[model samples]
Each structure stands twice: as structure tokens, then as C-alpha cells.
Target: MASLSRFRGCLAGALLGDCVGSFYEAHDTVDLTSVLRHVQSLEPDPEALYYTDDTAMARALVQSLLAKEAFDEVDMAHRFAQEYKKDPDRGYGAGVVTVFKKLLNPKCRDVFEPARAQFNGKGSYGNGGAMRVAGISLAYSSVQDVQKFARLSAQLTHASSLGYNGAILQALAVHLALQGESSSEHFLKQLLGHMEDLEGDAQSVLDARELGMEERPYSSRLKKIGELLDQASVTREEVVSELGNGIAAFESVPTAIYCFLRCMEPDPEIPSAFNSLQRTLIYSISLGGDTDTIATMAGAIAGAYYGMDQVPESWQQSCEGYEETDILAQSLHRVFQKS
Candidate 1:
């Protein structure tokens, strides 16, 4: 089924994005011309490219999803901590590292408690939740199911409403893209409806308000994404200043959405030879700060829409985890078909 290609595209695309975007992480801004030349010059060598924590967390999450055939919070939490323990050099954030330590404690009864208590019980609104939630979208076909599973999975380490809601938004975006609907308006309109439900949830609303998530949450950011897409030209500073390119969910998630939507049509700024997938990567990475996470999120959405064929062979071969990502993509496809 065509849906299967979208699944492959979503996961493998994240890997490709992570491998490439990891190169630009932590930089305040980017030098587009030089970066473009570097990307254009890459060869199909695995050693030349390596995924960072974004893809590492996502791969672990997908592996857990496949093993369970559904979202299992306990298994997912255990795996998150296990993956970090296996390799701390993957560049996990300190807050999550603390959560992982608590998760490892046999006596630490509630896995969600640590994250909830983080930052004086305010919890995290970090993009970690959204970054790893593409699997939930691909695994669950229904909109509500994707939203539910994404929220629950995120609560393992991101209990704040902003954190989980961003995950919900990411999954919903991926879900809409997976259908291969090309109309940007139709996509955002559908997302708007789903987000209204999320924001209107009685308990979630209270949680968001208590955490000040509604102060200027992802929904507001989504509206800005719509506005940005309509612009004749948006500079990198403007994109980062408006939608943001930071690590917070509100800052980066919508920025990723903007990148994906804009790449739907070829932009004169990027080389005409680049396809939609390549253009998506170049555009997202060009945003600078938190490049890996932003590009990974954008890449997942773009990959879902464009399908695997749009992803270049050289780019795929160059990524360290391409084979495993392909395997997970195939497995997710099989699971989705059966479901």
C-alpha cells in the first residue's frame, strides 16, 4: 500500500535528517552558502555520517513499539533509560539523563514521577518528546490513537502539557502527511481541528494553564507557521526569531512545520536540482540552532508526504543507521498493514 512508503519515508527520513543535521547542532546561526556546498559535496559513505541522540532515541522507541505491537508505557520508559545507559555519548540532555537515572532505580515506583518533579514540579517542555514521537504516528493509523499514544509516551519523561502536546502536534502532523495529501491548507486545517480538541481537553487545559503552556503554546506557533508559509521570502533570522530554532517544544516544533510546508513547492532559493526531500533538509538545517531536532521533525513530515523515492540514495547510504531505519520502516509498514 502507498501508506507503507510513507512509513518508510517517515523513519528513514528522520535518520537522514539526524545524520546530516547533527553536523550543525549548537551553532547560533548558519552560513548557508558554505553549508549548502558541504551538503552537496557529501559522498555515500557511512563513516562520513552518524546520527545523534535524536535518531538514537527514535530508533529505540520504534524498536519498543514493534516489540509491543502497541504503545506500552513501561516498556517504552525502560527502553529510553536502557538506551541512554548503553551510550551516554549520544548527547542526551541533562534533565533527561536525570530521569533515566530514576527510571533505572528498582525502588523508584513511578517512572513518570521524576520528570514531573523536574524543575520544581514544572516538568519539561523540551522538544525531546516531539523529537521521538514520529514512531507513534507511523505505528497508529487513527488520529485519536496517535494523539493518545504520543501523549502517554511523552509523559514517560515529559509530563508537562506543553511537552506532551507538542508530541501530539508532531504525531498529528506526521499522521496527516502519511495520507499523502498534498494540499497545505487541507493539512493545516485538519491539524487545527485536532489541536482544538487537544487544547480543549478539560484536564489538559488545566494542566497547560497551570504550567503556563497556553501562554503561547504550539497552537499559536502553528498559526504562525501558516502565516510564514504565505510569505514571499522569510530570512533565517526571521524564521528563528518568529517560530524559533531553540530546544523548547514551542520554539522548534512549529519551525519544523514551517520548513516542511514551505518545501512542498520548490523554492528559488535552493538549487533547482534538489528534490522536495533534499530541499526540506537544506531549509531546516539552514535555520541553525537545534538543527538536528528541527530537521529530524521536519524530515519526518516531509518524508511522509514525499515517500521514500524522494530520498536520495547517496544520502541514505551515507547515514550510519540507514539499514536499521529501513528495517524499522519495513516492520512498521507490516504492522500498519496488519492493523
Candidate 2:
């Protein structure tokens, strides 16, 4: 029972997390409550709760890790591009999707190597690649390995400095969660401490760190996004104001982290954390801006901390990716449990 539970813990958390988070990628605050799933259901991608590049890329990260015990840049990169081509339903941003598909062409394999970044030339700092990275944390046994795989794993799809930095932070978040020790505060400190030379999304990372330090009443952070959405004008600027719709790693990834931070609990265990974290993930999905990535990132962290027993078995059974999550989680267990 323990073994079964442990194996499923990984899959149950990661996949469901991403799938549920898919919705509300671009939704404003007013439409948030309507799409929040609160962690249950996994069919037809859920009503009004669509997923996007976050989930799709997350799937590739797992597949890449499973293909080898650790990260394989070539396979990882290839899988990322192939998956994007194979399924366009994931709602990827134009920039990422374009780069992913371009890698498919033998002649265009290096398209992203020196591709233009933010604003087309600054290099992307979006969370699209980072959100899908929790799988790396589960695949490896230690922080060192987590870093190794996380860096290379992201390179397949995202090679920019900031892009990989996001992956590093997200993966570490999962690793910390797996030990049942992750928290907005601890993670924030470690994140800033480890990456001394922050850039791109540094402001957001610091903001999360500051938010973690200052602290607030329960759900205050999520409530903040909700509040912003409510008060902000329906104008495009308003919607993207606090919750950016851009594909930059900074925009979406941090937003997910923010939502999760808002809903964090004292106990990071499943069933216990489930009630709170799931609610947050669902709300985040509906709240908009990189919905899929937010879900994927939150799921990875929560999944790592709580494991399978905390996930809803019924929901796990119903999800289309259940089998894959089960296989990978179990496979990861074989490698991790012994350690």
C-alpha cells in the first residue's frame, strides 16, 4: 500500500495539477470563479478550464526524463518540439509554439540556439518552459541532480539564461516540496540566495520572496489577484496588469507561484494540503495568465510535497494522462525511494 501510494503520489500531483491549471490562461478576475476547479475533474480538459503550453511542455519534461534517468538535451528538446507539433490544443503562445515547431525541421534544429528573446530580441523570460519543470525534481534523487536535469531539461525547449533560471527555481521548489519542507518563505530565500545574479524575472522572484517574508492572512495573495482583477478596468491593460498574459518566464511562472504562495498551508501533506492547494490551483487556472503553466508549476510543487495519497484517485483515474503520470511516478519512485 505504501509503495503503491508513493508511486502514484508523483503522477497524481503533477499531471492533474497541470491539467486543472490549463484554464483561464488569459481570463480576467471577473471570470475567475466560474472556471476554478478546486482540484476535481479531468475530462474534455474541463469546462471553460482549458490548458496550454504549460501543461504541454510539462508533459515533455517528464517524457524527456523518463527516456533517460536524467536529462537528455537532445531527446528533451526533440520531445518538446514534437509534442507541440503533435498537439496544438495546448494553447501555446505564438513565440514558444513557433520556436518549438521550428526545431522539428532538420534544417531549423538550431533555430532557438540564438533566437531573439523578450520583445522578440531580448530573449524569452516567460514561465512556459519553467512551469513544466517539476518532473525533473521527481526524477532525480538530490538537489545536485535536480539542478543538472532541470537546466538541461529546459534547454531542449528554452535555452535562454533566464529561461533556465526559471526551470532551476521551479525544479528546486519541487525538490524542496518532496522533502515536505518547501514554503514560500524558505523557497524565496533559497531562490534569491542560490541565484545571486538574478535577471529577467528577478523582480518577480524578489517580490515572491518579499511576500513570503512579510506574510499575510490566509489566501491573501490569491485574493490580491482576484481583487486586482475585480477593481482593474476590463481594458486589456487591466487584465494583463498584475497577471501578465505574456509568454515570458517571469509573467506566467511567477503568477502561479504567487497563487500557490497565497494558498500555502502549515502542513504540506496530501489530503491535508489538498483542500487548500487544490482550491488555489483551480482559482489560479480561472484567474488567467498562463493558466496551464500556473497549474503545472503549482501541481509540481504540491505534488512533490504531498505525493500521490493526497491526490483524488477518481480524478486521477479519469484524466487522459493518468496512465503516463502513473508510469512515470512509479518509475521515479523506483529510482528515488531507495535513496
Candidate 3:
């Protein structure tokens, strides 16, 4: 079983990453020095940094799971819709906002229809699904349960195979880290095998073809990650060009995984004085596009591996919802133990 500290670390790391990385969200380019400066600004009790839609959706998932004690699709959908209704200005993408609006309509019968109707039937392949999936990893102990529920949960707002599959990959990364399997090569290999199985499905193959890509897209990206890591040195341009750093799930999820694995050891660009979690967040933001979501995903993985001890207390205090997230993490840990 994973330690409660790891559980706390995973959620806290995710929330803090969203809070910190939101400062640099949507930048075309972010310099390492600027990222370092922004992180340093958190010292001595600066104002609380608010999280974006990433933490907002994740918090709703945690609450719904605790309330239902299982994956209740309708309840989870309602919670997501209600949360968006309550806080619409949380930097939500315009596309997902339409899904939230439709979910709120009492006339809507099928809960999943709004998402399925997205993108004129192709459905959204956005990273929104992967960004908020960490809590699902903490809620379930079994890998099957994690993958199943992660896909189902993402289906509420992201019906495309690429979108939901990215959620599974992200959840799997957190699940593995909670179990202490975060070493770079072993971690990448595990994720690669899982994606190979998932993307082998006929729908996944069709989705890749529809998007004008090869079959097993995520598995191919994981192979690219392996190659990049094998290099003596890799540039930000290489990572962004090769793996991508955009809003699409296909573009961003593997990039987030790459961020976590690459930061397992210190990068020369990041100060060695910072711990791995800090380095992970800094390096993720320095990659620029979709900073909050990428860093939040990477931070969840790093935090589960490094535990709460490595997470700076002031950093936690600086995030908007830290205390509640800590409570939810403890609750999820208890639930995991019982299961």
C-alpha cells in the first residue's frame, strides 16, 4: 500500500503546480530565470495564488468520489457542471464551457451526450480530461479501477478516445508513483506497455487515422520520449517540436509525462538547490504552452514519488485550496486503505 504522505503529496503537488504554473499559463516562451524568480516570490507569505479549472474540476471529482464511494457518472457530471456554474471564470476553455452549459440543462437526458456532440461529432481531444484526473488515481488502488474510472470520468466532457486515453495515462502515472515505481526508464516502459494495449483498440486506431496520424499515437510518443531522454542533452525547442506543448491531449499529456520523467534527476537549467518536485514544476513551466495543466500533471506524479516532505510548506500555503485538498487526500487515502 502507498503511504498517506504520498497521497497528500500527490494532491498537494497537483494543486500547487496549478497555482504556481497559472502565473505563466499561455506564454509563448518562458525563461528559466523568470520561472525561478516567480517561484522565489512565493517566499515570506505572498498572496494566495488561485488555481485554474484544472484544480476546480479535480476537487469536484474528489468530492463526488468521497460522496458516492464509487464512480457515479451522473453525480460526477453534476458536480463538474455545478462547479463550473459556481466558478465560471476559472480560465475554462471556451469549448468545455459549452459542455458545462449543456450539462446544466435539465432537458438533457444523456449525461455524456454533451461531450459526445463536441467538435461536430469527433469530440474534443483536449487536455482538459488529463488535467483533472489525478484524484482518480488516489481514489482507487487497483490499476484496472483507476484506468476504467479515469476513462469514464473523462467521457463526461471528452468523448474522443485520444482525450479519455490521455486521462488513463495520466492517472496511471500517478498510480505508479503512489506505488513507488517512478524511476525514469521503468516508469516510461510501464506507461508505454499500457498505452500499447489501450491504443490497440479499434476505436483508438480509427481516431488516430481520423486525426491524420499513425496508429498507437501515444505509444509512439512514449517511444519518442525514450529517445529524447537517451540523448546527452535535449533543448526546449526539441521537446516542444517533437512531443508538443499544446491544448490537445495528444499534444500535451505525453509532454507532461516527459516533464515528470526528465525531472527525476536535476536538470542543469534548474538550480540543484531545489528539490525534484520544485525542479519538475520549474522545468514544466519553462516549457511554456499549457503550463498549468502540464505542471499540475507532472507535479502530481513527482509529489507522489517525493512525498509531502519535499513539498515546501510555504508553497502549499500559497495555493488557494491547499487545506481542503490536504483533507481530501487524507480521506482518499483512508478510502484506498479500506478498499
Candidate 4:
């Protein structure tokens, strides 16, 4: 596929997954499954569904790239901070805002600002990095390009090696999807190839992993959330089984990928991608926990690959901003051409 086509597909797919997963965000995955069999509603409509931190951060990254066409960590973080200031309630994560404020601490603006919150003196391992990778994938030239941009974009929000590694995994996954090599096995194996080390590697998690799903029923998307939630608990194995809404790049991004993989079917075309994507957002919204992050990660994966054309026109009626995503898509096209 042309990079632009892949970008459009990938972007829409992420948003679709975000919306579908919205309703089930923090619910017991089993409870979500109950709704899935019946009706998906972790939250009511209007309040029921919308984008979150993932899409917001993704947009910020795209805007930064459009403004510069290359990575600049300090500038990117500053742009994120400014955007947060414009509307702090626009689903910006609390921990992230804390980090953003620290970055603005004047003395730390030019350096990797250590958070006062003591996540290893680094900001966090939240999937904020993972969510933005789709944008980087669209703009980069190769695996190297994905790794380069993924590292730079991630360093904007997270400094720990884990944070960067997680984001790079997401980037490679999407970049490979763009190249039409997105089987679940390849996704996991190639992910291992991309990373210098697998951090806390898990065959259980990898075995549970899935991707490259181009289609899914609206109901299946709604039902899976709850089943995953049922498997959730405090145990690491439980967490791995359920992929409950953890903030770690490892946990959340894989959950999002799993959702896409499990839901993948065939020729969703347009109208189908629309409803399925919407249900996926609802799944995220209702499920709770790390509402914004889950939605964001899910949104990035689905939007980039599946929901390209099915973004609800009416949903964006009050979006107040559109040029950023569109321009980023176009810029990705330009970059791909040059490459």
C-alpha cells in the first residue's frame, strides 16, 4: 500500500478501536463481555464515546512533525505542554500533566526533565509513547526511520529505557502493517527484532498476542472487552491474560493490538468499519481504568490500519481541529515519496 493509504487506514483503524474499546475501558473484561453479548455501555452516549489522551498526543506529535518535518524532543514536549495548557481537561492524563509542568520548569525545558514524582526520576512508562507511534510510522522511511522517530517522539514524554522501547515496538508494528507483513506471529517476532532487549519478556503475553486483523464484527469488538476483563486480576499472569488497562507501554499497546487481532475478519470496507470502529471506541470508554490511555492506544492502532475512512463525520462536528491530522497524513505521503 502507498504510505498515505496505509496512514489513512492506520489512523482510522486506531480511532475505531479506541471508540469501540471506550465503553469497556476499566470494567471487568468479563462484564464487558456480558455487554458485548447484549449491549456495550460502560458509559452513556455523548459521555459514552470520544477520543482521549492517545489521539490527543498523537495529534500533538503530528502537528510537531508538520511544523518541523523532523524530530526535536524539547520542541515536541513544549508543543505538548502548550496544547495541554490550552485545554487541560481535553483528556490529558494527570501524571502526564505533572510531567509536562515539570518540563516547563524553566530550568528543565531544554533537557530531559526529571519528574518530581519519582518514576525512576523519569516521567512514566505510560503508553503515551505507544499511541503516537502510528504518526511516526506514517512519516518515516524504513524500520530505521520508525526507530529513529519513535525514540525521539517518546523521549518527549518518557525518558526511561522501557518507555522508549515500548514506543518503538508500537512503531515497528504499524510500520510492518504498512508493508503488508502484519501477521500476529510476525508482529511479535519482528517486535523482538526491533528492540535491543525484551525488557520483561513474556511468552504468555506473546502467545496471547495478535495483529493484522483487517476486519471484525461490531458485536465481536464489543464482546471481547468483557472476556478480557474477566481474566483480569492483580497477578501478573492475570494481567497478561486480561491485558487489563495498565499504563505501561507494554501492557496497553499489546491489549490494543490484541483487540485488533481478535477482531480482524475480512473486507470491512467502509460502513462496516464505521460501526465496528464506533463500537470499539464505546468499548474503551465504558471499560474505565486508564480511560484515556486505553482509548488512545486502541485508537492509534485501529485508526492507522482499519478505520481510515469510517471516522464519524458527525462525531468531529465539534472537533475544533482537523487540519493537523489531515496535514500529517499528507506530509507522510511526501516523506514516503522522498524515501
Candidate 5:
């Protein structure tokens, strides 16, 4: 069973990453010095940093999962739409906002239609699905259920296999972390095997072909991650060019995993004084594209590995929904224990 502290850490880490990384969300360049200065500025009575759509959506997913005690598609869909209706300016992507709007309609019985209709029927392949997937990893004990629900949840607003598969990958990473598989080599091997199985499915194959990419795109990326990590020294430019830091699922999810793994040992760029979780956040944000989402995902994995005690109190206090997120994580842990 996963420890209660690890669960708390996972949620808190994700929340902190979002809050901190939002400060540098989409810059083309982010130097280590600037990132360190921003961290230093949070020392004295820092104002609360608000979480974006990432936390908002994740909070709703946890609530729905706890309420239903299973993956209830309708309930989850309604919660997402209702949350968006209640607070429409959580920095949600324009494409997903359209899905939420259609979901709000009384006549829209097929909840997945709006998503499937996007991009001339290609649907969104963005990182939105992966960003909010940590909660699903905590809810289920079995790997199959985790993968199943993660895919289903993403399919609600992300029909493209690239999109939903990213959710599966992110959730699986958290699942592995919860079980204390912190060694980068072992963790990547497990993720590679699972992704290879998933990416071989007809939909995944079709999607990759339609997108004009090779088969088993995620598996190929995971291999690249291993290669990059094997190198004694790799530049940020190389990591970005090879793994990417873009909005696409293929670009961002693996990068988040790389950030978590790479930070297990201090990087030359990051100050050694910072703890692993802090280093993960700083390094993730310094990559500069989609900072909040990438860092949030990395933070979730790192937190699960390091446990809640590793999350700095100052950082937690600075995020808008920290207390509430902790409560939800505790509740999810309890439910997981019961199951």
C-alpha cells in the first residue's frame, strides 16, 4: 500500500509546481539564475499563487472519483463542465473550453462528442489530459484500472490517442512512484514496456499514422530518454530539442518524466542546496515551454517518490488551494486503503 504522506506529497507537489511554474509559463527562454531569484523571492510573506485549470480540473476528478467510488463517466464529465462554468478563467485551453461548453448542453447526450469533433475530427493531442491525471493514479490499486480510467477520463475531452495515451503514461508514472520505484532505470523500463503494449493498439497506430509520425511514438521517446540520461552531461538545448517542451502530449509528458528522473541527482545547472522536489520544479520551469503543466506533472511524480514531508511548507502556503488539495489527497488515500 502507498503511504499517506506520499499521497499528500503527490498532490501538494503538483499544486506547488503549478503555482510556481505559472510565473514562467510560456517564455522562450528561462535561465537558472532567474528561476533561483524567483524562488528566493517567495521567502517573505509571499502572496498566494493561484493554480490554473490544471488543479481545478484535477480537484474535480478526485471529488468525482471519491463520490462514485469508481470511474463514472457522466459524473466526471458533469463535474468538469460545472467547475468550468463556476470559474471559467482558470487558464483552460480554448479547445477544451469548447468541449466543456458543449457538455453543458442538456441535449448533448454523447459527452465525448465535443472532443471527438475537434480539429476536423482529429481531436486535441494537447497536454491537458496529462496535466490532471495524477488523481487517477492514486484512486486505483491495480495497474490495469489505472490505465483504463486514465484513458477513459482523457477521452472525455481528448479523443486523439496521443492525448489520452499521455494521460495513461502520466498516471502510470505516478502509480510507479507510489509503489516506491524511484530508480530511474527500473522506472523507465516498466514505463517503456507498458507504453509499448498500449501504443501497439489499433487506435494508437492509426493516430500516429494520421499525425505523420512513427509507430510506438511514446516508446521511441522513452528510449530517447534513456539515451539522454546515459550521457554524462546534456545541455538544456539538447533536452528541449530531443524531448521537447511544447503543448503537445508527445512533447511534454516525457519531458516531465525526464525532469523528475534527471533531478534525482543534482544537475550542474541547479543549485545543490535545493532538495529534490525543489530541484525538479526549478529545472522543469527552466525548460520554459508549458512550464506549469510540465512542472505539475514532474512534481506529482517527485512528490510521490519523496513523500509529503519533502514539500516545503513555504511553497505549500503560497499555493491558493493547498489546504483543500491536501484534504482531497488524504481522502483519496483513505479510499485507496479501503479498496
Candidate 6:
């Protein structure tokens, strides 16, 4: 059974990563000098460690899942809009805010109708779906349950095939990691299996596309991650060149997975001052683009594999929402065992 420590680690780690990584979200290039300066302290100033939309939406999902056991799309949608309305400066992507507004429509019949209406019916292919799915990772045990609920949860705001498929991949990564499968070879193999199943369904949706639209396969990205892992010394240039560090689902999700896998075994590239947990976040942030989202995703995977005890308490206590995330993660663990 996956332990409660791991469950707490998954959510708390993601929150910390998001908070820390937000400092350098979209730099043209990352300087290791700045990276070292921030991490060397090991004690972040609490004022600087606040989570972004990633943690905000994730917390909302946890609340709904804890209340309902199963996903309540309408209620979940309301929670999302409520969070955004309460604090409009939570770094929500513009497209998602539009969906949240539509979700508030009294005449909105189906919970998913607003998301489906996005981008002139193409829907959003952003990583928002994948970014907020850590809740379901702790809520469900079976891949069947994870896949179903993860897809449904993503569809509440992201109806595109790529959008929800990215969420599936993220949830599956956490699910596998909680079972102690952190090795790059085994992890990628399982992710590939799930991607294969996901692609069949994704292609079904793609068949009805309006001629010019294209389906981006997660398999190709997973294959690249496997290749990157086989290297003796992978460089930052190679990582960003091949895997990419953009906000797009295909660009960032696999990149985050690769960051977690590479940091599993130490590399001379990262400073020795950093421990394993810190190394994971440092490496993710060092990737440059979409730092918070990438780090949050990588942190969740690494945290599940290493457990909450593995993370330094000093670092944990400094981050905003850490206590809330930790407590909810524990609650989700109990729910996972019972459900």
C-alpha cells in the first residue's frame, strides 16, 4: 500500500516547488548563479514562498474530492471559479479565467459545456489540467479509477484531447511513483503503456477535427525522455532543445518527468550542497521556461517516491500552503484506502 507519508509528500512537495519556482517563471535563460543563491539558504523567506494557480486549483480539487469521494463536476467548477474570484491574482492563464466565468453562468446546462466552447470548439490544450491533478493521485488506487477521474477532472476546464491526456499522464506518474517505481526505465515503460491506451481514445476525438487540427502524441515525447535518460551526461541545452520547457502540455509534462528521473541519481552538474529533494526542484527550476509548473510536476513525482520524511522540515515550514497541503494530503490518503 502507498503510505500516508508519500501522499503528504506529493501535495506538499508540489506546493513548495510551485512557490519556489515562481521566482523565475519565464526567464529567457536561467543562470545557475541565481539558482544557487536561492537554494543555498535552504530557508526561504516565508513572504516569498506563495503558490500560484497550480496550488490554488489543486487545493480546490482536494476540497471537492474529499467532500464527494467521486468527482462532482458542477461543484468542482464552482470551487475553481470561487478561488479565482476570491484572488484574481493567482496567476491563472487568461483562457482558464474565461472558462471560469462561463462556468458561473446560471444557464450553463452541462458542467463541461463551457470548456468545450473554448477556442471556438477546439478547447484548451494547455497544461492547466495536468498542473492541478495531484488530488486524484492520492484519492484513487487503481489505474482505471485514476484514468477515469483524472480525465473527468481535467475535462471540467479542459476538453481538448491533449489537455486531459496530459492530466492522465501526470496522475499515472504519481500513481506509479507511490508504488516505489521511480527508475527511469520502468517509469517510462508504464507511462508509455498508459499513453498507448490514452492515444486510442484521443485519436477517436481527433477523427472529428476540423481538417487543419493535428493530434500531438505523448508517446513520442515519452520516447525522447527514455533517450535522454540513457545519456552519460545530459546538458541543459539538450534538455531544453529536445524536451522543451514551454507551457504547452506536450512540451512541459514530459520535461517535468525527465527532471524527476534525472535527479534520482546524482550528477556533478548540480551543486553538492543540495540534497535529493532540493536537487529535484533545483533541476526543474534550472530548466528556465514555465519554471513553477515544471517544478511542481517534478516535485510531485519525486516527493511520492521519496516520502514527506525525506523533505527537510525547514524548507517545508517556509512555504505558503504547506500545512494545508500536508493536512489535506493525509486526509486524501485515508480516503484512498477507504474508497
Q: What are the lDDT scores of the predictions, listed in order?
A: 0.84, 0.59, 0.90, 0.57, 0.91, 0.84
lDDT of 1 at 321: 70
C-alpha TM-scores of all predictions? 0.95, 0.72, 0.97, 0.70, 0.97, 0.94
Which order, best to worst by lDDT? 5, 3, 1, 6, 2, 4
lDDT (0-100) at residue 285 of candidate 1?
90
Per-prediction tally of clashes:
0, 18, 0, 58, 0, 0
Clashing pairs in 1: none
The digit string of per-residue lDDT tens for model 1 on 99-174 reads 9999999987787898899878878889899999999988888888998899988888887777888888998999
lDDT of 4: 0.57
Best of the candidates, lDDT: 5
Clashing pairs in 6: none
lDDT of 5 at 20: 92
For each of the candidates, the C-alpha root-mean-square deviation to the true structure, in angstroms, is 2.0, 7.5, 1.4, 8.6, 1.4, 2.3
- 1 against 6, candidate with superior lDDT: 1
Residue 289 shift from truth in candidate 4, angstroms: 4.0
Off by over 4 Å in 1: 44-46, 202-216
* TM-score: model 2 vs. ground truth: 0.72
- Candidate 4 per-residue lDDT over residues 5-50, each given as its tens digit: 5676566555444444444555544344454532323323684346
